[PDB]
Write a protein that binds this ligand. Structure first.
Ligand SMILES: CC(C)(COP(=O)(O)OP(=O)(O)OC[C@H]1O[C@@H](n2cnc3c(N)ncnc32)[C@H](O)[C@@H]1OP(=O)(O)O)[C@@H](O)C(=O)NCCC(=O)NCCS
Ligand SMILES: CC(C)(COP(=O)(O)OP(=O)(O)OC[C@H]1O[C@@H](n2cnc3c(N)ncnc32)[C@H](O)[C@@H]1OP(=O)(O)O)[C@@H](O)C(=O)NCCC(=O)NCCS
Ligand SMILES: CC(C)(COP(=O)(O)OP(=O)(O)OC[C@H]1O[C@@H](n2cnc3c(N)ncnc32)[C@H](O)[C@@H]1OP(=O)(O)O)[C@@H](O)C(=O)NCCC(=O)NCCS
Ligand SMILES: CC(C)(COP(=O)(O)OP(=O)(O)OC[C@H]1O[C@@H](n2cnc3c(N)ncnc32)[C@H](O)[C@@H]1OP(=O)(O)O)[C@@H](O)C(=O)NCCC(=O)NCCS
Lengths: 151, 151, 154, 155, 155, 154
């Protein structure tokens, strides 16, 4: 039992609004993190057809800021699976819709675990990579899992 | 000066969460309306490269509900333009990620106006329909504009 | 099963709220979506007071924004049940913005929504009939069937 | 010198009680009710003074009853009396039980609001003109309450 | 019979003051400060009683200073005294000026929290053991405050 | 330009918050994203108190969730500046959940963030050096350079 990465790929666009932002109008790091987890959860739920929980997130380096009201664009997809777990890759851009300037904000990996109605880990289907980027992320996922185990 | 409909097409997926919902867990009509306007604003801003305001929304018939935490999926695109105004079509589905059940929630049209930094209406580029659905929505937009004028 | 009607006055609702930065676009004008969310909120309160039930929004009619509030204004909303079907209620909502510093009050919009009472299963449930009492209420009641025909149409 | 009827300031709010607003048994937090009381008081005082305002104080608030999820809270505020830059605002809060239609008095409170100019300095406010018997009674009794606020804040 | 040190209940919160929380001049709404005071009081009382709680009352709250955007508000609460099912909770609030580092006392307040069982009925609470001199003084003076709350709520 | 350091104690921050339904998945477990948002919030407060400046989040290190709070628990967060660069501060944040009904307290996670002070233009700005005083603070200070090398690496 397997599904393509495309089945669960999720896209989001959010207007950056005053409450999301700090008193100079820059988006809070924590709002970006919340949105990253939201898209990873949606992505993992689509792949597993299950409630999910976040087991961990890898380091997140914020390469650029976003300001009120840029658009924040997020993409997520499942890159690799374990028995009950899914690695999800999320890529975030900010898009200044007035100027057309679009910049990479961050990219990261999360580990999501499917759980049943009682909260017990639940087996998940395998993922089938199709693009070259997908195939590369899948081939490199075991190594990332080993670093998580070490840390 | 014109751009394809695809340039401004915007997709959103949102997890339906307890605060979005009523004490029986059904999403509030008004949250759906807020999300519809948000995606229309993003769509119009992408087309016009401008701040926008909502001049009006047409009637919205809610064909189905969404529950916590379905995914709500929204798509918006510019269908037709006036001098400073854009008609934006928005289509909303609810997706029960546990069961795979996906249902049309609503579809509607909004009228967005591009405004300059001082809030004055601003000319917008024309839109170039490419699909058959796009061509049909564009051909039918003048008639919808006439009904708005009458009402 | 109840025979009596309930007066419009039973469920008439007033809200007043200061316009704050979350509600507003980067030029300080309130988002249409925020006004729409508040319109539904007041319609939901009004319908719940009439039906003493959970409710869902079946539809909203077209909304034309006649003006826009600015961050810091007060938004003033009033809603009331204008007419009833079997399980459905028409709710009329009127919105104004009030500049509290200058005293300028302007009409924002007016709207009709259709609210449906639901049981704990989410299935439509009968509602009490409404009784119009003021002349304004009676005029809205008189004109409700024509409005409902258009909704049947679309 | 300038005075306006109480009715100019009078403001009503209604709020739905939802799960984020309540303890795990479904009783609304005291703090949400307090938040709503100050909100309506600020609106009331802004209407009377046509100014930004700040909350100087709130008197004690005794909760006579609760409200629970899906109920509605109804608030009403009006200016009852004024000093030079300060306004006493009375607020009453009721719950409306959305299953039975029963209205219950939740609490009542007085606040002291201060009008401020654009630099945040206290600014003169007009007087209020009581018209109902309730308003006249609250106006008549306001000086004593003001004296109590002076006493309680003294060393 | 059972008693616990004040320290078991003691709770600290810090909150950033942001634009949604303030008037258009940037001064935090009184109501937000009140909301935060009840939040910390509920946490405090839940820790003391290991129970759901409801707010019975808050005494008067006099705002000694303001807080403004990007400042931080610091709150501290602890149980000072108990009755059968009720707890007096003292809360202090300071602003921390994020440009200068200056801390200013914003306000202080007492609340009355009531522990409730799963049916929402008042439930017995343990006593509190004051240890600091401040705690002993607040404990010693609590009966008089309780008597005042009885008087003010009487007909 | 200031010569003196500031002690860790200047900016150490504690937060406590009840877990409510917005924070939670449909089975009542708190979202990772909510915990992450609260971790950043406390790191931002801590860094602002140290630098007396606006700040931005440059990065967060990996976060492993050791347990999950349930709606109604209290989340307890503590943050403090562990080490400083020129414009950057390392912030350590520790999170626990506390079941207030049962008294059970469990470690949720621990995390390191890098916060950068910025001027009104958004450009990095120098920060004061931090002084570790407790043994815990001194150990974290001692081990910060190794952690910073890994960040330089990625
Ligand atoms: C991080 C950022 C401030 C770096 O700015 P810069 O123009 O490259 O300037 P510098 O190279 O002098 O970096 C400033 C400091 O950040 C540190 N830094 C930069 N990226 C970092 C990272 N990913 N992790 C840890 N530290 C980092 C630098 O080492 C430097 O430290 P130092 O001054 O003590 O020596 C910049 O890339 C940025 O604004 N990113 C977005 C931050 C943001 O907006 N976050 C909110 C959510 S999007
Ligand atoms: C609207 C809805 C309740 C209709 O339910 P149904 O199973 O078709 O049952 P009925 O045909 O008996 O409809 C119930 C009432 O709604 C009315 N109705 C249905 N759709 C309507 C619409 N688009 N506009 C106005 N009234 C409508 C019917 O005319 C009927 O009125 P009546 O009972 O007075 O005669 C149903 O489609 C629904 O739950 N939609 C989603 C509502 C919702 O969840 N909104 C929140 C945001 S998604
Ligand atoms: C209340 C405050 C404005 C008083 O201002 P001030 O510089 O002392 O100047 P004044 O003495 O002229 O006070 C203005 C009015 O406030 C009244 N006042 C001050 N403190 C009061 C209190 N604790 N309770 C009731 N009235 C009070 C004064 O009696 C005066 O009344 P009057 O003008 O009608 O005679 C000031 O202490 C303050 O800004 N507090 C913070 C308010 C705030 O920001 N609250 C929101 C949450 S922190
Ligand atoms: C406060 C309340 C629980 C009192 O309960 P009750 O059924 O009257 O039962 P009791 O008389 O035994 O009250 C319990 C304790 O509350 C105390 N109390 C009641 N009202 C009080 C008030 N206004 N101020 C201070 N203490 C009060 C009583 O003195 C008693 O103290 P004790 O047990 O230590 O001797 C009840 O009136 C209530 O639920 N109010 C609403 C609370 C609420 O929901 N607040 C949130 C926002 S609406």
């Amino acid at each position: 039992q397997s599904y393509p990465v495309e089945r669960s790929r999720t896209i989001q666009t959010r207007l950056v609004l005053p409450p999301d932002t700090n008193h100079l109008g820059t988006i809070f790091g924590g709002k970006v993190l919340a949105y990253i987890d939201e898209i990873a959860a949606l992505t993992a739920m689509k792949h597993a057809n299950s409630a999910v929980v976040t087991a961990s997130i890898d380091s997140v380096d914020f390469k650029s800021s976003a300001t009120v009201g840029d658009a924040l664009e997020l993409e997520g997809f499942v890159t690799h699976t374990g028995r009950t777990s899914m690695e999800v890759y999320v890529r975030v851009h900010s898009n200044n819709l007035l100027t057309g300037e679009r910049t990479l904000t961050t990219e990261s990996f999360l580990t999501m675990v499917a759980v049943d109605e009682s909260g017990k880990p639940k087996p998940v289907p395998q993922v089938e990579p199709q693009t070259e980027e997908e195939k590369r992320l899948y081939e490199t996922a075991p190594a990332r899992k080993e670093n998580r185990k070490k840390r």
